[PDB]
Design a protein around this ligand. Sequence first.
Ligand SMILES: NC[C@@]1(c2ccccc2)Cc2c(ccc(Cl)c2-c2ccccc2C(N)=O)O1
Ligand SMILES: *C(=O)CCCCCCCCCCCCC
Length: 209
Amino acid sequence: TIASSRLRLLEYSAFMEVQRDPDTYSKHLFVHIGQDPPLEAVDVRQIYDKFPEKKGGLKELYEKGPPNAFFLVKFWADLNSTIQEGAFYGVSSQYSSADSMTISVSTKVCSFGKQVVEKVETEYARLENGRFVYRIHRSPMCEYMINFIHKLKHLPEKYMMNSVLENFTILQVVTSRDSQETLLVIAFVFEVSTSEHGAQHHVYKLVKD
Ligand SMILES: NC[C@@]1(c2ccccc2)Cc2c(ccc(Cl)c2-c2ccccc2C(N)=O)O1
Ligand SMILES: *C(=O)CCCCCCCCCCCCC
């Protein structure tokens, strides 16, 4: 469970979809976080080098606080060609909060500690069972990401894929749109899954000392 005092990530999944015929659709999940155990900590200074720094960087974000909003997710992405591929590469996520506020989700793709792509999406709360729910449904992946996945899929060894992924990170920062107050920050780090049970993940809490 990834949750700060203000926002809670409910679900997250990056996937691809193909239309085998007009009545058949196939969906492969690269990564997934479905719907509270204690979390193991990771010192934030160990990841600084691979995230974007200076003005608006992760070090300035952490210093600004609150620290209860920072998390690290290690992903073991399933890049196995389990379906044949006009394919849709997308990302679906969902959050919840006790307060009604408009959120802003920014996704920073980084290569060698330098921001290459950024995507900003404002999300409005929807009242549901006494809580506020934010839904991002089938947000298409940018061609940078689709091409990156194709390039990784073309490497002959999984160790080669993991070496490229050593200098690739995605930083997700959710802020209250109007106040600009940090609600949730999730640093995503990746490896290619070698498991027979597919995509795996591990959550950690980002700490300083
Ligand atoms: N293959 C190693 C790893 C990994 C391993 C398994 C699953 C996902 C990723 C660790 C890792 C990356 C990429 C970027 C970072 Cl920032 C990290 C990382 C994570 C925690 C602390 C320090 C660092 C670091 N700076 O290396 O790939
Ligand atoms: C906008 O393009 C944000 C895209 C975030 C994609 C999540 C990455 C999931 C695919 C796993 C491939 C291996 C590591 C990128």
